[PDB]
Design a protein around this nucleic acid. Structure first.
Lengths: 95, 65
DNA sequence: TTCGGGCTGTTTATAAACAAT
DNA sequence: AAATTGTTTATAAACAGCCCG
């Protein structure tokens, strides 16, 4: 029960996966993760870096802009449908 | 040398298909920094080929841009 | 022929500079 | 400014496929 055996990609995926509109704000990602996995309630300085790194880097995650600017300071993220259901397994162990 | 690995791999291919060890060589042949040692930065060269869509493996296979 | 180690690749994790908003 | 959010390179490592001695 030290670290959840998920990648950041896994985590971001199930985060987007778990939105009702299937779009989520970066801080919404941070939250979903900490809300559920106690490991990431500390230190959070660093692993939040690597979450942002995985959005920027990975073609599977699609930044779409905010709506009505409420409040703003960050676009929404989604999944390239080519990669929605990439973690077909369901337990997010492989992609 | 103030070049990235991507820079280095690029000018390697630039110099137009090359084998991974051919990359290693072009780099060491020219930049003494990457002569000693050479156990880690070769890792990151391979990492940059796998990772970056700009590099195209055609059939160690050859690499291109 | 099996074993167990070296290269190819590929994928992740972490840390950092650095720009955009 | 002043922080968050994004983009981009690094550096190391976990983990396959091999070809090979």
């Amino acid at each position: 029960l030290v670290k959840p055996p998920y990648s950041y990609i896994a985590l971001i995926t199930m985060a987007i996966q778990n939105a009702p509109e299937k779009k989520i704000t970066l801080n919404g990602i941070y939250q979903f993760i900490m809300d559920r996995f106690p490991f990431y309630r500390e230190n959070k300085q660093g692993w939040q870096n690597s979450i942002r790194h995985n959005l920027s880097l990975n073609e599977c995650f699609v930044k779409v802009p905010r709506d009505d600017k409420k409040p703003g300071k960050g676009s929404y993220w989604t999944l390239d449908p080519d990669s929605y259901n990439m973690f077909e397994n369901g337990s997010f162990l492989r992609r | 040398p103030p070049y990235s690995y991507i820079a280095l791999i690029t000018m390697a291919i630039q110099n137009k298909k090359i084998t991974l060890n051919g990359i290693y060589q072009f780099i060491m042949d020219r930049f003494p920094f990457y002569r000693e040692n050479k156990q880690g930065w070769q890792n990151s060269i391979r990492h940059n080929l796998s990772l970056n869509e700009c590099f195209v493996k055609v059939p160690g296979s050859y690499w291109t841009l």
